[PDB]
DNA sequence: TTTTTTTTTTTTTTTTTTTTTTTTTTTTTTTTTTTTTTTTTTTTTTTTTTT
């Protein structure tokens, strides 16, 4: 089988297509997440000059990336809400 | 030739200045936080247009 993804831009907004049918960003995203690519992570693209700036980042940004890939960023609000409650 | 007198060089002493070194104090750029504003993007209703 063969899949045809698309994305057309209108005005300011952008619309996504699956199998030549208009879809919303979230479901398209979820399909990609099934395929195995975390677009917000940005761990597999390297532009003109960033191959150096892969190494010299401040460690926090690298931790951010490693937290992003690992599906442990969604559990943030849960964490610090529990934190504030228990410290209170 | 020898004796007497003058002048230049060398070297030591001293005094003033300079340099050094640390220490303590001070005040400043640097670094982080928070906010927060802007701008871009988004949505949804309205408007326009088409069959």
From Swiss-Prot:
Subunit description: Forms a heterodimer with SMC3 in cohesin complexes. Cohesin complexes are composed of the SMC1 (SMC1A or SMC1B) and SMC3 heterodimer attached via their SMC hinge domain, RAD21 which link them, and one STAG protein (STAG1, STAG2 or STAG3), which interacts with RAD21. In germ cell cohesin complexes, SMC1A is mutually exclusive with SMC1B. Interacts with BRCA1. Found in a complex with CDCA5, SMC3 and RAD21, PDS5A/SCC-112 and PDS5B/APRIN. Interacts with NDC80. Interacts with BRAT1. Found in a complex containing POLE and SMC3. Interacts with RPGR, STAG3 and SYCP2.
Coiled coil: 15-35
Reported function: Involved in chromosome cohesion during cell cycle and in DNA repair. Central component of cohesin complex. The cohesin complex is required for the cohesion of sister chromatids after DNA replication. The cohesin complex apparently forms a large proteinaceous ring within which sister chromatids can be trapped. At anaphase, the complex is cleaved and dissociates from chromatin, allowing sister chromatids to segregate. The cohesin complex may also play a role in spindle pole assembly during mitosis.
Posttranslational mods: Ubiquitinated by the DCX(DCAF15) complex, leading to its degradation.
Family to which this protein belongs: Belongs to the SMC family. SMC1 subfamily.
Lineage, uppermost ranks: Eukaryota, Metazoa, Chordata, Craniata, Vertebrata
Disease: Cornelia de Lange syndrome 2: A form of Cornelia de Lange syndrome, a clinically heterogeneous developmental disorder associated with malformations affecting multiple systems. Characterized by facial dysmorphisms, abnormal hands and feet, growth delay, cognitive retardation, hirsutism, gastroesophageal dysfunction and cardiac, ophthalmologic and genitourinary anomalies.
Domain of life: Eukaryota
Extra remark: Mutated Cornelia de Lange cell lines display genomic instability and sensitivity to ionizing radiation and interstrand cross-linking agents.
Annotated localization: Nucleus; Chromosome; Chromosome, Centromere, Kinetochore
Domains: entry comment: The flexible SMC hinge domain, which separates the large intramolecular coiled coil regions, allows the heterotypic interaction with the corresponding domain of SMC3, forming a V-shaped heterodimer. The two heads of the heterodimer are then connected by different ends of the cleavable RAD21 protein, forming a ring structure.
Protein name: Structural maintenance of chromosomes protein 1A
């Amino acid at each position: 089988e063969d899949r045809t993804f698309a994305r057309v831009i209108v005005g300011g907004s952008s619309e996504y297509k699956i199998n030549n049918k208009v879809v919303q960003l979230h479901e398209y995203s979820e399909e990609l997440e099934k395929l195995g690519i975390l677009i917000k992570a940005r761990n597999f693209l390297v532009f003109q000059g960033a191959v150096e700036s892969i190494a010299m980042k401040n460690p926090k940004e690298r931790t951010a990336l490693f937290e992003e890939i690992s599906r442990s960023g969604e559990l943030a609000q849960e964490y610090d809400k529990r934190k504030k409650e228990m410290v209170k």
